[PDB]
Write a protein that binds this ligand. Structure first.
Ligand code: TPV
Lengths: 99, 99
């Protein structure tokens, strides 16, 4: 679909069989999710945002449904104020910015 | 134009007579620009992001040129790692998210 930005671009995602809400963020290189249990081993990572750096756990090859679209890639888990879907998964779903 | 997300969506903007690079961020409610001089009265505010909050000065009714497009609105000035154009101004230029 086509999404305008008068409201926050929130959508529904299915991850680990759970339904959660997430923000489509073109300014984010990566995808960051709130604390939860994902399968597999993780690797450490540190990412920067508006107010400083946070430490997260990186999981590779996680399956996620975004507005019914399937994406499979890297998900970072950490202390984020909202679930963020960033560029790494937006390109998989074919998301573009138009004006 | 149509912007793909394989790379960061950075664009040239004109604010206060200076030229600058900015990131188009559909996840940001507000537009936040690196410390610079703007005319007018301002009000202090705190805005939150990944990493925590930062104190910024809020200027209203500022005119910005985004990719040759004119838009008007509130601009926050502070210690941000990157210049971010948020929804407040992306709507004014007719920017949308398509998938
Ligand atoms: C992983 C996130 C990437 C990003 C920082 C970008 C970056 C780019 C390259 C180099 C360094 C850093 C981009 C992002 O959208 C924000 C956030 C929202 C999650 C952000 C950005 C701009 C301003 C805000 N303050 S706010 O009041 O406009 C606000 C508050 C809350 C939210 C919510 F929608 F996330 F709740 C949105 N906006 C937030 C941020 O803090 O980090």
């Amino acid at each position: 679909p086509q999404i305008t930005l008068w409201k926050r671009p929130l959508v529904t995602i299915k991850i680990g069989g759970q339904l959660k809400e997430a923000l489509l963020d073109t300014g984010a290189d990566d995808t960051v999710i709130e604390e939860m249990s994902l399968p597999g081993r993780w690797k450490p990572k540190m990412i920067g945002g508006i107010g400083g750096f946070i430490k997260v756990r990186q999981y590779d090859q996680i399956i996620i449904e975004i507005c019914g679209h399937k994406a499979i890639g890297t998900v970072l888990v950490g202390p984020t104020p909202v679930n963020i879907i960033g560029r790494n998964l937006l390109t998989q779903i074919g998301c573009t910015l138009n004006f």
